[PDB]
Amino acid sequence: TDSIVKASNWRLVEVGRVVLIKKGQSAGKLAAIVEIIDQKKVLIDGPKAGVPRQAINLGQVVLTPLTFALPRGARTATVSKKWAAAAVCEKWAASSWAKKIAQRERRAALTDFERFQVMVLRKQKRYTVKKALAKA
Amino acid sequence: MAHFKEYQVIGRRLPTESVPEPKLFRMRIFASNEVIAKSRYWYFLQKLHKVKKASGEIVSINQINEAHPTKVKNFGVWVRYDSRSGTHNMYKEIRDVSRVAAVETLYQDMAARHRARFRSIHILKVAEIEKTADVKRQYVKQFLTKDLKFPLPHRVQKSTKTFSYKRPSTFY
Amino acid sequence: MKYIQTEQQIEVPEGVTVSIKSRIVKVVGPRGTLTKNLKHIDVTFTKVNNQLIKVAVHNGGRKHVAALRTVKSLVDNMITGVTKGYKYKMRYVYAHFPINVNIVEKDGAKFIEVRNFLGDKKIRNVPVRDGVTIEFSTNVKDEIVLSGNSVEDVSQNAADLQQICRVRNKDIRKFLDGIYVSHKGFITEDL
Amino acid sequence: VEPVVVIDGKGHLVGRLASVVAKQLLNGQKIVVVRAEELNISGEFFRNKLKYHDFLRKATAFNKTRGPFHFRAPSRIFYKALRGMVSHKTARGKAALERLKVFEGIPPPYDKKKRVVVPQALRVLRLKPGRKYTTLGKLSTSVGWKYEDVVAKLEAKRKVSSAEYYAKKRAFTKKVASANATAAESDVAKQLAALGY
RNA sequence: GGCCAGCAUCAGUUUUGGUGGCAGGAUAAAUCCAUAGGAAUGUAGCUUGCCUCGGUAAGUAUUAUAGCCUGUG
RNA sequence: AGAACUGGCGAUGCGGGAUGAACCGAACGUAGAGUUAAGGUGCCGGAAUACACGCUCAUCAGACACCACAAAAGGUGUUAG
RNA sequence: GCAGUCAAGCGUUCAUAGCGACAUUGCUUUUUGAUUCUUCGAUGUCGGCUCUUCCUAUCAUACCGAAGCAGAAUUCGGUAA
RNA sequence: UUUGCUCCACACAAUAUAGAUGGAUACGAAUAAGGCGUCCUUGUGGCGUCGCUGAACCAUAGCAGGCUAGCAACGGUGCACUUGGCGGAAAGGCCUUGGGUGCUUGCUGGCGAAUUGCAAUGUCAUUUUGCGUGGGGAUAAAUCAUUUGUAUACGACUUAGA
Ligand SMILES: [Mg+2]
Ligand SMILES: [Mg+2]
Ligand SMILES: [Mg+2]
Ligand SMILES: [Mg+2]
Ligand SMILES: [Mg+2]
Ligand SMILES: [Mg+2]
Ligand SMILES: [Mg+2]
Ligand SMILES: [Mg+2]
Ligand SMILES: [Mg+2]
């Protein structure tokens, strides 16, 4: 038999990490870490969505489960081509998290007539499901 | 005191018939505005030369923006300050993106660690350290190591609702 | 100052197999098994390649780091305990009255019974802990030997016997009568 | 937004829980705290045993009966702290305490009903990992509370039965989870995903 | 013509939002592009303990199949 | 106990200092709307369990001027020099 | 009145086991002074007897630590009213 | 003591409300860790996947929810019966076998609403008693006055008497 220690696997803060902004002028747009300052502050730079290069406090940003290759202290021009090189937008967009974000946005934007349609369709689905529970 | 800026100030006594064209003295102040910056100048010219705001005049008061706003640096700040007992000198070590930010931490830090107020401190010289291995302190040097990674254990989640239905996890 | 990360290395031999979930450290080896709750301590164990394990502390203060070095040692001693085992030897000292020690049964518990310490009528009992195994040494006069897997048990069981024999209302500089721990060692030889 | 709220008081801090409960009551909201003996308090045991001995020595000198009462059960140690934060000598303040019910353990009506948590009083989030705390069952017993082992056994009885109910619900939710997955195919499923639901 | 309301266009006091055009500063500073030098928290490349089908190795090297900094335009 | 200049209480309510002649704010006919002062914003109690950088763990912690007290002398407790 | 701090002389050698001068920093309101805020259309002004309760700055009684503690007999200090 | 007492049906009356207006929607433990699914060698196991708030999930169309003509299913749920279980912490509820019965917006049709006049909660909940309607059910005590002394200021206490 082997040792069998557990792990406590973590999302790290390092050069090349990609992050989602909580609150601010950007708020909800993706960014990428360039270089670290100390425990709490770091230097982000999202070249694509519409977010300036800035030092930001780690209390105002959330870490994702995704990292891309980047040299330390790279300029926006390099980071822009590196982000597009990373193919990270479609990878973020393909995931569950972003889908769940996209859903609660779609539920918000829903005219009174459609919320009715939904009700007419879910009643209609309910019937087909509860027959399957009745059979097996 | 406040969210700081950096200013340049220049002044030169008043002119006279016996001696036209005086000498022009200059300084670099950290303040929230111009009105406090002009005052600090006359405070520091009174500590050196035989002058006051009655005898003197300001020539040009100019803001100094940062040269590379989004580049990480290692500053070395000297400082003179009053304790309850005596009046000492120091050399703290700060790491930030701009000079004005390093001064904004230094004032906040001297207040925590020593109970030194704004009134009791003179920033002698903020100087950017160009080369690596010119860093005497330890708490800046830890971050200068190669391939630096570190986790953030124990994540919390500020809620809007008073009650919650699930029971929370502190994973990251 | 808060240290960004600090870590130590627990070096595992070939024989044993150390298991850890949450912070419950099982260590199965040749002599038996040992377990230890560490949920009070706040550290991360991390395996690398069977015969080496890393313990870590992240953003730790001064005192938080100190404990990290302790947790290494406690886990090291389970490993040395279950492989080599621990063995403490104690000796009796006296001038006039010889101390009569004997292991006695009482509801299946086993007690060390110290008799005639310094001319006393009060019989002194010391309950034998679970795992520790006491034996009186042949061919070395007035010697006793305790031995087992845990150090925490054996050493405590010795110190209990050491502390049951104190002299009250005399000059202890003169009255140096007692049962004292002479040598702490391991059970197996070589290492 | 519910006519009764049931708060599983475990892993909480007395005062931080006590502050939210008082304000809810005053605004018109029936609350019932269960499982009081699992509550916590900041700071080590010995500190907090000595704070309770400081309360015990205070008594009306000329006649101990009329003077201040010292309840030892953990439901009533929590009640005291909560009665402190309500204007209890007015008629408005009585009515607020009339909307409250505290219990050691989880008795019959309330053990087939959902329980919630107050995250801002929850000590796993509020305390720094490394600081010491006191469990409110342990403390009560040390100042004479003689129903710890009765509540310790009654709780162990319902944990077993509650674990048996969950094994049948969890097995049933798999069938419902398999049906919603297979139904998600025809036009009726595709139109709702466009429409958001 | 008595009791009480609602809806409009108006005036006086005020509160809270969305939104257009200009001026100033190192005629913002940055970014970004054209350009000379520079280096360590050293990329590719090259060579040595090398050796688990090939990475490590600790020197060299100033952009090459990463890049970075400073002046000046 | 006795003097010097000014501001007050006495003769004076109202908001703040839990409470108080003199402290801080502000001096009063009868109502509506807005705005602030000194002081505050866990619950009592109207208003951020706001944001941000740090320090401290106390088997008598500490918590807001006037004010309702604490000293010499020590401490490989921990933090900056 | 009570407590530290520094330690002169002592304690045959030996500053600090223990006696402990003088200085220097405090606490107490069980002493006595200093003052005159309350009471002169009156608060019964010594001691003793009787009886409850509270403080610890602990004489004894429990468990300990030191000693210039062989034993016995002591001295010093800690928790404790 | 003028047909008293009690539980169950519906009929009318009172007198209130610390405050209904879709649903209180049930593991336990850990947080320097876990939930949900799956496969074995059932373990402190291997593999997959989720969180980043209940912004959820369930219910939600018809005169405060009418009258009818059909289609596809054999489902979905109320209403009184009925067979069997579990619940004593304050159980007073929860599941469950079998019919009966109303509805069914799961899909397609045929009628009706106006005038409460340009808004006025526009009344639909649930406690506690009274009072007569009509169907069951059950037929006692205590105190004073007399008496005892294991008691006693008086009350109180303790005993006895068809
Ligand atoms: Mg007068
Ligand atoms: Mg006034
Ligand atoms: Mg005060
Ligand atoms: Mg003033
Ligand atoms: Mg409030
Ligand atoms: Mg007088
Ligand atoms: Mg009188
Ligand atoms: Mg009198
Ligand atoms: Mg004492």
Burial A68-107 (b: 16+ CB within 10 A, else e): bebeeebeeebbbebbeebebeeebeeeeebeeeeeeeee
Residue D124, strand partner residues: none
Closest Cα partner for C134 from C108, C118, C115, C154? C154
Residue C10, strand partner residues: C53
How far apart CA D58 and CA D74 sit, in angstroms, is 20
Closest Cα partner for A62 from A9, A18, A94, A8? A18
CB D127 within 8 A of CB D42: yes
The CA distances from residue D116 to B163, B168, C114, C186, in Å, are 7, 11, 59, 54
Six-digit token string for C61 = 């203060």
Q: Collect contacts of D57-60 with beta carbons under 8 A, ≥24 apart.
A: none
* Sequence-ordered alpha helix ranges (H) in chain A: 76-86, 88-94, 96-108, 112-135
Instruction: Look up residue C128 and give its DSSP letter.
Output: P
CB B31 within 8 A of CB B43: no
Return the HEC string of D1-58: CCCCEEEEEEEEEHHHHHHHHHHHHHCCCCEEEEEEEEEEEECCHHHHHHHHHHHHCC
Cα B139 from chain centroid? 19
Whether C1-85 shares its CATH topology with C86-191 is answered yes
The CA distances from residue B148 to B34, C54, D162, in Å, are 41, 18, 48
SS3 C7: strand
CA–centroid distance, residue A126 to ligand 8 (Å)? 90
What fold is seen in the domain D1-147? Ribosomal Protein L13p; Chain: A; (3.90.1180)
Mutate to test the interface with D, among A129, A130, A131, A135 (most CBs of D within 10 A): A129
How far apart CA A6 and CA A3 sit, in angstroms, is 10
Instruction: Look up residue D96 and give its DSSP letter.
Output: H
What is chain A's length?
136
Question: Which helix (H) or strand (E) segment is A45 a member of?
Answer: none
Q: Where are the domains of chain D?
A: 1-147, 148-197
How far apart CA B98 and CA B84 sit, in angstroms, is 31
Question: How many domains are there within chain B?
Answer: 2
B90: domain range? 70-146
- Are both B47 and B81 inside the same structural domain? no
Closest Cα partner for D24 from A2, B162, C138? B162
- Pick from C1, C3, C58: CB nearest B151: C58
Alpha-carbon torsion C60, C66, C69, C74, what sign?
Answer: negative
How far apart CA C106 and CA C146 sit, in angstroms, is 20
A112-135 and D187-195 helices, crossing angle to 10°: 140
CB D123 within 8 A of CB D113: no
How far apart CA C83 and CA C16 sit, in angstroms, is 8
Instruction: Look up residue B141 and give its DSSP letter.
Output: G
Closest Cα partner for C142 from C176, C95, C99, C78? C99
The integer distance in angstroms from the CA atom of C166 to the C1' atom of G59 is 30
The integer distance in angstroms from the CA atom of D174 to the C1' atom of H37 is 9
Q: Classify strands D5-13 and D31-42 as parallel, antiparallel or unpaired.
A: parallel
Count of Cβ atoms closer than 10 Å to residue C40 Cβ: 9
How far apart CA A84 and CA A75 sit, in angstroms, is 14
In the numeric block, the tokens 């403390």 are attached to D139
Chain D residues lying within 8 Å of A132, measured CB to CB: 179, 182-183
Residues 59-88 of A with CB under 7 A from strand E: 71-78, 81
Count of Cβ atoms closer than 10 Å to residue C75 Cβ: 21
> May I ask the CATH class of domain D148-197?
mainly alpha
Cα C130 from chain centroid? 12
CB B57 within 8 A of CB B10: no
B157: left (phi over 0), alpha (psi -120 to 50) or beta: beta
Q: Does D19 touch chain B (CB under 8 A)?
A: no
Q: Where are the domains of chain C?
A: 1-85, 86-191
The CA distances from residue C7 to A13, B113, C59, in Å, are 18, 28, 11
CB C53 within 8 A of CB A5: yes
Mutate to test the interface with C, among B139, B155, B172 (most CBs of C within 10 A): B139
What fold is seen in the domain A12-94? SH3 type barrels. (2.30.30)
How far apart CA B151 and CA C7 sit, in angstroms, is 14
Q: What is the DSSP string of B9-77?
A: EEE-----SSS-S---EEEEEEESSHHHHHHHHHHHHHTTSS--TTT--EEEEEE---SSTTS-EEEEE
Residue C37, strand partner residues: C24
How far apart CA C29 and CA A1 sit, in angstroms, is 11
Closest Cα partner for B96 from B136, B57, B69? B69
* Sequence-ordered alpha helix ranges (H) in C122-165: 151-164
> Could you tell me which CATH number the domain at C86-191 has?
3.90.930.12
Residue B60, strand partner residues: B10
How far apart CA B88 and CA B15 sit, in angstroms, is 38
Cα C66 from chain centroid? 21
Which amino acid is located at B107 in the chain? Answer: Y
Which residues, at least 6 apart from A33, have a Cβ–Cβ distance to it below 8 Å? Answer: A13, A14, A15, A16, A17, A18, A19, A42, A43, A44
Closest Cα partner for D55 from D37, D86, D80? D80
SS3 A46: coil
What fold is seen in the domain C1-85? Outer Surface Protein A; domain 3 (3.90.930)
